Design a protein around this ligand. Structure first.
Ligand SMILES: [Zn+2]
Ligand SMILES: [Zn+2]
Lengths: 111, 169, 145, 417, 239
């Protein structure tokens, strides 16, 4: 997530400033700059497990194709819940199950 | 013998359920150079094949000397162990492209099953014999396997003919 | 060798091709205003004991690090020798919770060339093993003598 | 009372087969064709052009008569399929069009025969619909016959259904290893009126893993080569700032991976800043021109963005918001498939396929034949004008081209001229 | 249920030539203007006033493959459109799909879609007949009689379709429904017979919520495959 400009609405870029040796977000379309307090700029992970939660919506409770179980909910201890697997299409995706309750409609794993 | 075959099939289904439970909790041992899903599929396929072989062996051992199919098999004129096994005990697991029946629909093989179902009956296992008949899902899976076999034979014949002609020339 | 499983395992590990990409789990670009220290407290002790404001940070996988039977000294020496003295390297021992090996461009806007160097490190760097060997399996052969 | 038994299911199936039959799809498709498609095709282009002596023509109602047989003696009589089969005739009915002259000194019921359309047996315009059992036996027709076939030269012809991929849908696929393109997004555009394919558009994601230098995303439109990167066409449709571009593409700001993947597109497209320069770049790369100056470039770009760019959505100016929204949705789907979150679309999924029956094929054939007839009549009227003579409006129309085209296409099976 | 699984030619045409099933049908095509009018009347918002900052949970609505707008209550809209289609106001050959995972609402009125009919199982929780077929013995009696108990009309297949007991589903919609193979499967059966075949356990789910039921599985075969006696006791190449 990179910050955007204010008058031309363009994303900014890191740049080094020498008299105060500061990292700043700058725009080339115009002359708008701002201070950058985060050295964290580039992220590239070879193996990730982000996205296993999937796009769960409050309307997932009435899907008839999803299997139904009777697992113990953490907070409301409901006996009605559904379960599925990770949405990620990675080759090495694990088979850990994801459970969603019905009274509170929130997720919980086996951990 | 039918009771023994049913007991063996039920025990195999329980073992497959145990394998599924182990795999879903990150307990299945990882085969060297293979993915977890591939290892789980191989384990399930091996268990189902062993179950089919055991049921066929029991059915063959039950056969009397006066049985005509056993006489044909012993003579070697026609028939084999697999024919008796499929006619009397169990058709077995249906395989397409070397794997079980894929999820053609959204995470399910047929719309009559729930999503993410890995039980044998949901992925092309025909636990009934030809004498007992086939359920509609088993019938469809058997038809898929037969169509795959026919296509494979048809594409193989032309390549074999061209290779033979090239060798002769 | 064929009668000893340990020596066969050692030679199998030596034969297998392992590169930097095969063990690197994540890469980051950081801005370090002071060469003497660092903003993060995880590597603050490391930079204090072991001692262009841009830095390259690599995070590895412990299970895959021990799978190849590799130490930090080996990979640090490899990355040092592969680039000669054109890229300063600061490597941490196993005491660090995060498997961090930092790289700094030698002084003599530098985002594009630094990203190119990082891509070079990710792709072309090879630690040990015969190239072209994706996987090695141990097979038990029964012979008659 | 009691639960539904198997006998009740068989009763339901018997009712189904009694109401519809076995060849219901053929008859329904042909009836829909003969009821709507002919009128739609003749009203699609009802303006033939050539005080300012504004010669205008009008195409009116389409009239169908029962299948009649006309002989060398000139006598016309009602014809039945048995007679056509015995005498090697064609079971067809004439079509009459109200071609009306509207000269009217410029700004300040003819029932013209246009051809013979073959009639499918047991269809609503066949003579064997209301006929009872006794008269069916009288006409040497088997009551067990189901129909659904044409009779051409005394031969029974059946139209096999044609299976094709569905149009106006977005499908994302992968690519082989020796190719710069990693993932591809394809759409086949066809308007609802007539269901005819116009053109196809293809979005490609250049750049293999650890290769390809910049991982740009490039669109490929009709009437153009040298595929244009997607950010420039975004700017060309009229969305200049990049923040709106990312809002159109990515609907969740938490997806930093999508933004990181899209960053090369912004880096490559930073060379283009305004809508006009993007339009000029498209015109220069748009072909169909060679040094034809900037105004023609921008006019061609306007034409290629208003028309032929997803024509199934709209074909008029001032409505590019939904066009760019659909394009952003397509890019989002492509990136979701590339991010290994959604599996690639299956080409064998039977729900993404359509079956062309006699209806659509006959509609396309009639459209082609009507276009040919209009071209021929235009040539005839321009020849009559340049020869300074008055036409009777009846010798200009050639029913022979339509009749022969339909007969030959149905008899041989080659679906074309 | 759409093409015959057994009937196919041999050679270069193997698998490329198919035969329609007995209950299979082909869509004719209906105008999409009433669909758009109903959607607009039921609170559909256009794309002109779409604000992605606030519409982060709104579901997109696709009609004939184009994005026409967004909605905030997909469940109510889906239920209303399904009820309107089941009442005969909308043409029965209209495909209505709700992708909950992708948050999409697809409506198809195209030509060439292959569909098959299926029984309708009561879905609403308030109804006492939940989990049972909507069609009762009264419908069977009316079908056998040939008229409705009120000559004036005919009680046939169309009367059953417009009464909300049988509906058409295509391949795309089939991914969003749960189908029971036999009506006896709609009730959870509470022996050890060595002659009859063994049904699947289906024990992977604690509870089952079927939305449709097959009229008869043997209807999945084609015309030529319907002649074979006991095709389930044979090998598929023989069929
Ligand atoms: Zn700016
Ligand atoms: Zn709960």
């Amino acid at each position: 997530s990179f910050r955007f400009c204010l008058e031309c609405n363009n994303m900014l870029y890191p740049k080094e400033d020498k008299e105060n040796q500061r990292l700043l977000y700058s725009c080339r379309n115009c002359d708008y700059t701002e201070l950058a307090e985060d050295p964290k700029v580039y992220r590239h992970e070879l193996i990730t497990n982000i996205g296993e939660t999937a796009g769960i919506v409050d309307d997932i409770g009435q899907d008839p194709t999803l299997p139904r179980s009777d697992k113990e909910c953490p907070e409301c201890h409901s006996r009605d819940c559904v379960f599925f697997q990770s949405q990620q299409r990675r080759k090495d995706t694990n088979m850990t199950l994801f459970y969603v309750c019905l009274n509170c409609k929130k997720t919980f794993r086996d951990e | 013998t039918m009771k023994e075959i049913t007991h063996a099939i039920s025990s195999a289904k329980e073992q497959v359920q145990e394998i599924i439970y182990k795999a879903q909790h990150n307990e299945l041992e990882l085969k060297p150079g293979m993915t977890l899903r591939e290892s789980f599929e191989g384990e399930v396929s091996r268990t189902l094949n062993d179950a089919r072989d055991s049921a066929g062996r029991s059915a063959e051992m039950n056969l009397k000397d006066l049985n005509n199919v056993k006489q044909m098999v012993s003579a070697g004129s026609k028939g084999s162990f697999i024919n008796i096994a499929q006619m009397s005990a169990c058709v077995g697991q249906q395989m397409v492209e070397g794997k079980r029946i894929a999820f053609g629909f959204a995470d399910r093989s047929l719309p009559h099953f729930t999503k993410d179902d890995f039980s044998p009956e949901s992925k092309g296992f025909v636990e009934n014999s030809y004498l007992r008949g086939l359920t509609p899902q088993e019938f469809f899976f058997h038809a898929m396997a037969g169509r795959e076999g026919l296509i494979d034979t048809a594409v193989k014949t032309a390549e074999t003919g061209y290779i033979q002609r090239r060798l002769v020339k | 060798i064929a009668l000893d499983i340990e020596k066969a395992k050692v030679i199998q590990s030596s034969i297998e091709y392992t590169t930097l990409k095969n063990v690197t789990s994540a890469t980051e670009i950081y801005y370090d205003p002071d060469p003497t220290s660092t903003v993060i407290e995880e590597d603050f002790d490391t930079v204090e004991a072991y001692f262009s404001p841009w830095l390259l940070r690599l995070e590895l996988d412990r299970a895959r690090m021990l799978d190849k039977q590799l130490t930090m000294n080996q990979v640090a020496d490899k990355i040092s020798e592969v680039f000669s003295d054109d890229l300063f390297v600061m490597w941490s021992e196993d005491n660090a919770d995060k498997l961090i090996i930092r790289c700094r461009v030698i002084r003599d806007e530098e985002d594009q060339m630094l990203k190119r160097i990082e891509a070079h490190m990710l792709d072309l760097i090879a630690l040990r093993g015969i190239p072209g060997i994706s996987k090695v399996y141990m097979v038990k052969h029964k012979v008659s003598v | 009372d009691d639960t539904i038994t198997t006998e009740d299911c068989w009763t339901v199936i018997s009712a189904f087969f009694e109401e519809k039959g076995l060849v219901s799809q053929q008859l329904d498709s042909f009836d829909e064709f003969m009821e709507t498609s002919i009128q739609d095709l003749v009203w699609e282009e009802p303006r033939l052009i050539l005080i300012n002596k504004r010669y205008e023509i009008r195409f009116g109602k389409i009239y169908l008569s029962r299948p009649t047989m006309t002989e060398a003696d000139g006598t016309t009589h009602a014809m039945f399929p048995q007679e056509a089969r015995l005498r090697n005739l064609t079971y067809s009915s004439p079509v009459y069009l109200d071609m009306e002259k509207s000269m009217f000194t410029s700004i300040d019921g003819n029932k013209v025969h246009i051809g013979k359309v073959p009639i499918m047996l047991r269809s609503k315009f066949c003579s064997l619909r209301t006929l009872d059992e006794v008269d069916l036996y009288k006409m040497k027709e088997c009551p067990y016959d189901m129909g659904g076939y044409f009779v051409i030269n005394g031969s029974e012809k059946v139209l096999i259904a044609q299976e094709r991929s569905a149009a106006n849908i977005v499908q994302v696929f992968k690519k082989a290893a020796p190719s710069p393109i990693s993932h591809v997004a394809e759409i086949r555009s066809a308007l609802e009126k007539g269901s005819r394919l116009i053109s196809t558009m293809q979005i490609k994601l250049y750049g293999r893993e650890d290769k390809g230098t910049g991982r740009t995303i490039k669109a490929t439109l009709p009437y153009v080569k040298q595929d244009i990167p997607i950010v420039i066409v975004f700017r060309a449709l009229g969305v200049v700032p990049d923040g709106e571009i990312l809002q159109h593409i990515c609907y969740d700001e938490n997806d930093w991976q999508m933004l990181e993947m899209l960053k090369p597109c912004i880096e490559e497209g930073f060379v283009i800043q305004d809508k006009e320069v993007a339009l000029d770049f498209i015109g220069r790369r748009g072909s169909a021109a060679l040094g034809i100056r900037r105004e023609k470039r921008i006019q061609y770009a306007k034409d290629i963005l208003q028309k032929e760019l997803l024509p199934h959505i709209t074909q008029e100016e001032g409505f590019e918001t939904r066009k760019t929204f659909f394009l952003g949705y397509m890019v989002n789907r492509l990136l979701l498939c590339a991010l290994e979150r959604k599996d690639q679309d299956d080409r064998d999924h039977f729900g993404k396929k359509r079956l062309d029956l006699a209806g659509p094929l006959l509609a396309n054939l009639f459209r082609i034949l009507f276009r040919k007839l209009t071209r021929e009549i235009y040539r005839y009227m321009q020849r009559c004008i340049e020869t300074d003579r008055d036409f009777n409006l009846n010798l200009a129309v050639k029913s022979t081209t339509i009749t022969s085209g339909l007969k030959y296409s149905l008899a041989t099976g080659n679906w074309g001229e | 249920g759409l093409v015959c699984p057994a009937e196919t030619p041999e050679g270069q045409a193997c698998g490329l030539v198919k035969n329609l099933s007995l209950l299979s049908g082909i869509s004719i095509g209906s105008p999409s203007e009433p669909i758009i009018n109903f959607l607009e009347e039921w609170g559909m918002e256009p794309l002109e006033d779409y604000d992605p900052a606030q519409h982060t949970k709104s579901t997109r609505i696709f009609v004939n493959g184009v994005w026409t707008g967004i909605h905030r209550d997909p469940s109510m809209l889906v239920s209303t459109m399904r009820d309107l289609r089941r009442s005969g106001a909308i043409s029965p050959e209209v495909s209505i799909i709700r992708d909950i995972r992708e948050r999409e609402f697809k409506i198809f009125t195209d030509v060439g879609r292959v569909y098959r009919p299926l029984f309708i199982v009561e879905d609403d929780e308030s109804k006492d007949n939940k989990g049972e077929l909507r069609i009762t013995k009264e419908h069977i009696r009316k079908i056998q009689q040939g008229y409705d108990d009120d000559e004036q009309d005919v009680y046939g297949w169309s009367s059953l379709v417009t009464s909300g007991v049988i509906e058409y589903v295509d391949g795309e919609e089939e991914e969003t429904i749960m189908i029971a193979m036999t009506p006896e499967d709609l009730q959870t059966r509470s022996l050890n017979d060595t002659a009859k075949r063994i049904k699947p356990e289906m024990s992977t789910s604690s509870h089952h919520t079927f939305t449709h039921c097959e009229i008869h599985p043997s209807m999945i075969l084609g015309v030529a495959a319907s002649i074979i006696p006991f095709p389930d006791h044979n090998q598929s190449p023989r069929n």
